[PDB]
Design a protein around this ligand. Sequence first.
Ligand code: NI
Length: 491
Amino acid sequence: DVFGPWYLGPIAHPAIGIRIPEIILTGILRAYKKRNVAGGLMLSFGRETAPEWVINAPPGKYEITRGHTGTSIRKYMTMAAEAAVKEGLVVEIEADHLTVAPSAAEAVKRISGVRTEYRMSEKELGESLNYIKAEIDEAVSTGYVNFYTIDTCFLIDYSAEEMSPGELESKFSTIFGDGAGDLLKRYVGRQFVYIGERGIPYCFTFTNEEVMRLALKYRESLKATKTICDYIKSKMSKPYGIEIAFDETPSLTKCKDMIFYLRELWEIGIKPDFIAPNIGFEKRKDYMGDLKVLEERVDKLAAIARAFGALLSIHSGSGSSPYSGKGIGTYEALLRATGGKIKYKISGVYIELLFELLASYPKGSKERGLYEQIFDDVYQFLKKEVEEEGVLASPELELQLKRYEEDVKNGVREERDPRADFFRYYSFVALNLRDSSGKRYLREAIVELYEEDRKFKERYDKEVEALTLRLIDGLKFENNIINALAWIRQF
Ligand code: NI
């Protein structure tokens, strides 16, 4: 009998972040149980979660952005595993975005519309890797981790695309040496053909110059991915999978880049189950492009991933509102493009939902008082970050803060609107703000409200379940457990 944490393999499934496992797990597991779903439960190792020793550190040691949910790796993994065992459910415990980066604030800025174009030192690379290993150690120590997403997008060298032909060749020869010819031979003068769900065969060929650029573009990303995957392999006594996070990049993912990246991974002995391309999805927004163009693009990239025994993993899955999915028509275009064989990720949307729910109670109520305190403390914390040029300060944040001010001044927007841009993007800091005794006072209050107020618990659980069911029914994950067991049985 199969239940609790299992590695599900490259099969269609939702994977859902649990920023406050205490309040979110009931509604999610209800929905999973109702639609007979094998789902993932996760948090991002670069931003949302952190090791215990980061979480339990005193105020001020670590940037607000590191483990900003207040939820440790041990905690989310143990709570989710144990909840699932208790509910008789198969789930996958995933470590989302193992992120190479100089800081969590940079990893956050990256997905909040902030132009930083920072460049990492060698010591920084080393420490980021050590941070990741330590995070891994905590995951492994729980006995429950099934799956890791690796994010080395910070290491992608965009200068390789702009090098002079003479500089290019010279660097290529020097780096790759006697392996240069082998590397070119894998690609140049070959017609690659990948067939999508549509039945359209897509043709790709490569010039030497293209291969040389791709190779220089991705060498550091590939090397770090290798180091991370070797460390995971050295520590895991149970089977697991890898996802490549390839989505937090400045432009759309190109077909040839992905062919190359997956193939080079393959050459060094890494076969991801999932790859997450940039397809034009943005955090906190319904899809803002042409649905036909989207389907076309996803059909191609899905076909490519398929030939490497992989599915696409869709990040930035939540949209403009907790109720909007990712826009009308968006799920249908993804399903046609993938025949339903797809992994889809959401996380932050559950806290947006929490906050708007609190905001919807009447002034006079404690629920709404709590909301207003959250909003006020966030606003003031961020003003102070801009004021003191703290770690989250940026021109973009400053503008959003001014936009909110202007709008309330001109009666365009009401005070404490949870839809104000700055709050939508930066409300996450609420869960890591601390009182003078260093407690996460707002996260503690939320959990208290939930644990002690029966009517609040009930309404939130219903909203969480409902949101998870919209995702499940929208992307046809109902009964996906069948393929998960077909994978597991093979072992
Ligand atoms: Ni993501």
